[PDB]
Amino acid sequence: VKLKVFHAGSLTEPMKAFKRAFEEKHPNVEVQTEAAGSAATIRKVTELGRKADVIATADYTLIQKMMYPEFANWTIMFAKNQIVLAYRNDSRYADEINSQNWYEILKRPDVRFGFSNPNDDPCGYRSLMAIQLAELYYNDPTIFDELVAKNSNLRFSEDNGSYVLRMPSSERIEINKSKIMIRSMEMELIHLVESGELDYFFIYKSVAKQHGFNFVELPVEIDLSSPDYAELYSKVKVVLANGKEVTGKPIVYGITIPKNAENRELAVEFVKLVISEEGQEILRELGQEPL
Numbered sequence: 001v002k003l004k005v006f007h008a009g010s011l012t013e014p015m016k017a018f019k020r021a022f023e024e025k026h027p028n029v030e031v032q033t034e035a036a037g038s039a040a041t042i043r044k045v046t047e048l049g050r051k052a053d054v055i056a057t058a059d060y061t062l063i064q065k066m067m068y069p070e071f072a073n074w075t076i077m078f079a080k081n082q083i084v085l086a087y088r089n090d091s092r093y094a095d096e097i098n099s100q101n102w103y104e105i106l107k108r109p110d111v112r113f114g115f116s117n118p119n120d121d122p123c124g125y126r127s128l129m130a131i132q133l134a135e136l137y138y139n140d141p142t143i144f145d146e147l148v149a150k151n152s153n154l155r156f157s158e159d160n161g162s163y164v165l166r167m168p169s170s171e172r173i174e175i176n177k178s179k180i181m182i183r184s185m186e187m188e189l190i191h192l193v194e195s196g197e198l199d200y201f202f203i204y205k206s207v208a209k210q211h212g213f214n215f216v217e218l219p220v221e222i223d224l225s226s227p228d229y230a231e232l233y234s235k236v237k238v239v240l241a242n243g244k245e246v247t248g249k250p251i252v253y254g255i256t257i258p259k260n261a262e263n264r265e266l267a268v269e270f271v272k273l274v275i276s277e278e279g280q281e282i283l284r285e286l287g288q289e290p291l
Contacts, residue, residue: 003266004051008038008058008253009187010081010123013210017282023274031267034096037121037185039240042066051260053267055062056274058204060254061123065244072256078275079253079288082205082225083123083130086213091199094214098120102216103134103143106200111145114193115201115218116186118154118238119170122246123186125238126224127202129248131223132163133235151176162235169241204251208289222249229257252291 003022007015012035021051036044038057044050046066057063063102085102087094097105102120106113116124144167149155153174155161168174175182181198183189187202190211205225208215217223221232233248240246255274257267273279281291 001029001263001266002262003029003270004046004055005031005056005270006041006050006052006053007033007035007054007056008041009035009121009185010058010204011035011056012187013207013286014288015282017286018270018274018279021278021282025273026266026269031240031270034184035187038062039066039114039122039242040120040184041288045258045260046071051262053261053263054256054270055258056253056255056256057122058251059246059249060120060252061246061249062244063254063256066242067256067258071260073077074210074273075170075254076271077252077254077291078279080225080281080288081251081288082204082217083126083202084208084210084215084260085200085222086193086203086215086219087200088193088213088214090196091193091214093199097200097216099216099218102218103138103147104129107146109209111200111262112198113202114181114183114189114198115202116189117170117182117184118165119173119241120184121252123180123202123204125240125246126248126251128154128165128238129155129233129236130202130224131233132165133171133248135143136161136178136232136235137221139218141224148180151179155244156236162237164237164239166239167241179210201219206286209287224248226250255289267277
C-alpha cells in the first residue's frame with residue numbers, strides 16, 4: 001500500500017522520521033511524501049486533481065479556508081515554530097549581524113536576501129508580516145518600505161495601527177533581482193544561500209537548525225512564535241491572490257485527512273502517530289516545540 005502524504009516544506013525533516021516510524025509499525029506500507037508550500041500543497045487536491053491521504057500545513061487555518069467543505073471538514077492543530085533570519089558563516093557581514101542591527105545590515109546595497117512566495121507558502125507571508133511588525137516594535141516606519149516595498153511591488157497599507165498587504169497574483173509579483181530572490185517554498189531558499197546567491201533568508205528556526213545555518217532571533221513581538229503576543233501579531237494581515245485573508249497569528253501547524261483519501265484507515269493511523277507523544281518528540285528533536 002502507498003500512503004500519500006502532502007506536506008508543508010518545513011515538515012520535510014520530520015516527515016523522514018514519521019515515514020521511518022510508520023513503516024516500522026506497518027511493513028506493508030510505503031509512505032510517499034511530497035513537499036510544497038502549504039497553500040500549493042493544498043491546491044494539489046483542490047485544483048490539480050490529486051488524491052492525498054494526509055495533508056499537513058504550516059498554518060492550520062489554511063485547511064479550513066481552502067478545503068472546507070468539499071475537500072475536508074476537520075483539522076487537528078499541532079506544533080509551533082518561529083521566524084528567524086538565517087545565514088552562513090561566509091554570508092556578507094555575518095560576523096557583524098545581531099538582533100539589534102539586522103535590518104540595517106539587510107539595507108546595505110551589497111547584501112542580498114530571500115523569502116518565499118506568500119501566495120504559496122506560510123513562511124513567505126509570515127516573513128513579510130514579521131518585517132512589517134518590526135516597524136511597530138522598533139517604532140521605525142521605514143523598515144518594510146526600504147527592505148521590501150522599494151524592492152518589489154509588495155506593499156502594506158496602514159490604518160490606525162493595522163496593516164494590510166494585498167498580494168498580486170504570483171505571475172504579477174515583481175522583485176528587484178539585485179536585492180531579493182523569492183521561491184515558491186522556503187525550503188528552496190536553502191539552495192540559494194548554500195550556493196552564495198543569497199546572504200540571508202527569512203526562515204523557520206526549526207529549518208535553520210536542521211540545516212546548520214546561523215540565525216538571528218527576531219523580537220518575540222514580531223516573530224510569530226508565542227501565544228502570549230497574539231494581540232501584537234494580529235495587527236498585520238495579508239490577502240493572498242486567491243482572496244483568502246491570513247492574519248498574523250502564533251505559528252501552529254495543522255493536519256487533516258482529505259475526503260477523497262484512498263487509504264483512510266492507514267491515514268488515521270498516520271495522523272495518530274504525528275500527534276502522539278512519539279510524534280511530539282520527533283518534532284521537538286527537530287526544533288518544533290509542542291502545543
